[PDB]
Amino acid sequence: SKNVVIYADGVYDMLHLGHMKQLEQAKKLFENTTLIVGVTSDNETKLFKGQVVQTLEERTETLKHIRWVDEIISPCPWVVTPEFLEKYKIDYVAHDDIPYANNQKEDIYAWLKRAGKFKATQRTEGVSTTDLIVRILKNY
C-alpha cells in the first residue's frame, strides 16, 4: 500500500492525553503514513489564540518523544496554504472538524474539506493538565 503524508498542526501546549490520542488518530488514518506535526510559533499563538505556557522549544521537544510523530515542522505557519502542501508533499491535513476562524476566514480548514484533503480527528475532553491541578485542588 502506498504511503500517505498526514499533517497535524496545533499549538500542542503542555502536551496531554487528548493531543496524544489525536496524533495517534492522525498517524493511523491509513495503513502506511508519515505523520508531520507542525508547532505554532510563540508570537503567533499569543497573537491569534492566547497565552501559551511553554515556549516553542519546550512544546517541540516533547513532540519528539511521542511514538506517532514522524517529522516536525517547527515553527509551522498558521494557515495551511496550497503551496505548503506541495512543498512538504502532504496528502491530508488532520485536526478536529470544529471550524477554526481567522479574522478573514470563518474556517481556515474550509478549502481542505472542499478539496477532500481534510481528515477529521476527534477530541479527548477532561484530560488536560489544567484539569489535573483542579483535581489536585481536592486535597485542600
Where along the sequence are the contacts to its own copies (CB under 8 A)? 14, 17, 20-21, 23-24, 51, 53-54, 58, 61-62, 65-69, 129, 132-133, 135-136, 139
- CA 38 to CA 66: how far, in whole Å? 14
- CA 116 to CA 98: how far, in whole Å? 16
Q: Which is nearer to its own copies, 14 or 108 (CB)?
A: 14
Contact 94, 70 (CB under 8 A): no
**For residue 99, cis peptide bond before it (omega within 30 degrees of 0):** no
Convert residues 24-43 into a mask of x (bound to ligand CDC by CB under 6 A) and - (unbound).
----------------x---
- What is the footprint of ligand CDC within residues 121-140 (CB under 6 A)? 121, 123-125
CB under 5 to 8 A by kind: which of ligand CDC, its own copies, none does 52 bind? none
Q: Is 49 annotated as a binding residue?
A: yes
Single out the residue of 14, 18, 111, 113 in contact with ligand CDC (rule: CB under 6 A).
Answer: 18
The 10 Å CB-count burial string (b at 16+, else e) for 73-89 is bbbbebebeeebbeeee
Binding residues: 11-12, 19, 49, 96, 124
